[model samples]
Target: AQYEDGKQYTTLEKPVAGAPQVLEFFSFFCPHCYQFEEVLHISDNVKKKLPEGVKMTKYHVNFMGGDLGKDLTQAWAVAMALGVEDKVTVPLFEGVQKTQTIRSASDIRDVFINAGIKGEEYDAAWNSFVVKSLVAQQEKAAADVQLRGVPAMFVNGKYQLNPQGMDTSNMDVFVQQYADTVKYLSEK
Candidate 1:
């Protein structure tokens, strides 16, 4: 609760309108983001410990993969709309960062298809007004943040977590401290 300004976290110039919220800016093309999820499992650990009613949302950054960045964001939007984010996230990361399998929009579509979503269902969500809007919002949010790194966590739309000197030697201790910081900022 006694975290320093500009050290543990920094206050946003314009706080987004939502309490108990954590917005994550990340990309499948980012190795660090992949490690954050797959290796460290930071998001999963934080989610389990967050205060009640805290909503954790992810915005796939659109500044990483050129035109493919937009496509990837759209893919995430579709997955979210169809309630298949959990099924597709890790695979998408693997496809882009590790396996070198995913290269285009069609490949992204295939990932969704492999997740038990019918091709037509994926198409519908891909082209839906709701999904398009979501993608646009994500792009705009990323632009607003002017992000310089991946796996950034913004608490309550106001405090941006700055994990510069946190003890990352132990995953358990790190996750607990990260969750604690989020909880502290959410109440502010």
Candidate 2:
């Protein structure tokens, strides 16, 4: 009783080369994505169970925020560049989905500032080549996967895990099963 392709997951046509990695497509404005983080704590849990050398990569999709989508993506790239994703992810999610405090790029900058990143440092990273390239790459990834929804998990850049196929009876079991599936796929 193992997960099967086209049932529990689907293989990508343009498979991404980076193996042994979990690529998550999500957006801060997505409620399900927010719950995936806040309620389920999926990312943290999954990371803990991942095999050594396996890394989790996040791509912030730009279709969720209307005119602000690209800006949000840029802000996420900046957070990554500054190595402050752990600090800014929840706040950005809260600001966009719950508090409605993050309306513009300036507001997003303030979030980074609040996270102890200096305003100047935030500004520099916002326009830095590394962040810009990362943002561009993320946008391309969203398109490459033909992404239609948030919280999409792709294992080893090939298998797209279908949430509908996962056991969702309880949070603990779900996380365990999810991590197991990811582990299984990573080795494939």
Candidate 3:
């Protein structure tokens, strides 16, 4: 029913099953993730393109100054399980970076509702079994994957990109390239 244990960690939430899954790993505090926003978001010929049947989930992983990051990564997993992943991931990222707050579920949800999500729906979903289970998944990933930081990406349970490279200027390119790589892997 699950991927069991593995040696490496990737951003994908679940196995691709039959279709390709594209997962983008990002962090709230990472300047590189913020810096790479545009490229990762660039359109294919001015169109936001992803292969049909391809799923994209942004895996939010964070660590800051010290324990400030907490286990808020649960927010992401929970959102995905509650069927709010589509609506919330980008907003969450925007809120975390733009509003500079991803410190807790309450804070994150308030931002989501302000961004147009219903407060009730958020409350119910955040505490749903799926979301809570996702929190547990993050715990497993942390123990099994040894992830160093954020801005990682995966395709069909495979590592298309991770924190492979970093520099002052190439962050955006890396993100775009990673997106392209996932697209290539999943596209027909």
Candidate 4:
């Protein structure tokens, strides 16, 4: 189903602070998010064309884990803190969803090590106070809004993008659609 402009995004009652924020709620365990990265190129697409005063942030969802998703959620906070989110983000998703080799904290550590993060460096961020705090923060933020699923987008914390039930056949349209939606909301 192709989504109509304005129709696909739900307006939020309460908005976020500071610059207009374009936040993405996602999870490494989510197959759709992995596909979103592989096909739509989440960062390159939205970050490259953001409007003035607009900022893009990714929130790792705290859902779907006993060991798998939980570890990844923490790993994402570390990745963001270390400024390597853009580096290992997609690869981590691929490892979880495609390669089948990434299943635990140790495996995730290997992925980080392969990405040039030293063992000590990984240890520092793996369970650092900051990592724990930020992970909690992102988790609370998503829960505050009752976010139910991933690859979800919010503009200034006021719009939850609904892709009109988008599927692989319509994947090509997401980036442009999301950018345009964000641009419209940012101007408000």
Tell me, by TM-score, which candidate is best. Answer: 2
- For each candidate in the order shown, give its overall lDDT on alpha carbons: 0.83, 0.85, 0.54, 0.76
Q: Show where candidate 2 strays beyond 4 Å.
A: 18-20
Off by over 4 Å in 4: 1-6, 13-20, 165-170
Ranking by lDDT: 2, 1, 4, 3
In candidate 4, position 51 carries an lDDT of 69
Candidate 3: the clashing residue pairs are 78-131
TM-scores of all candidate predictions against the true structure: 0.92, 0.93, 0.60, 0.87
Which stretches in model 1 have alpha-carbon errors above 4 Å? 18-20
Residue 134 local lDDT, model 4: 86
lDDT of 4 by residue, 1-188 (tens): 34444576776677655422777888888887776788778667777677656567788876766678888888988898899986798679878888888877889899999999889998988869999898988887787677878878877667777766334356657667766666666666
* Model 1, span 1-188: residue lDDT tens: 46887877888887766433788889998887888889878888778777787678888987788888889999999977888889999999999988889999999888888889998888988899999898988877766666777889888767899877478788778778887787777777
For candidate 1, the per-residue lDDT at 175 reads 72
Q: Write the per-residue lDDT of candidate 3 for residues 113-181, one digit (tens) a residue.
A: 776768787777666787777766655544334557665555565444533432226646644554454
Better of 3 and 4 by TM-score: 4
- Order of models, best TM-score first: 2, 1, 4, 3
Model 2, 69-165: lDDT tens digits are 8899999899888889999999999999899999999999888889899998999888899998999889877777778898899887689987778
Worst 10 residues of 4 by lDDT: 163-172
RMSD of each: 1.8, 1.6, 7.4, 2.9
What C-alpha lDDT does candidate 3 achieve relative to the native structure? 0.54
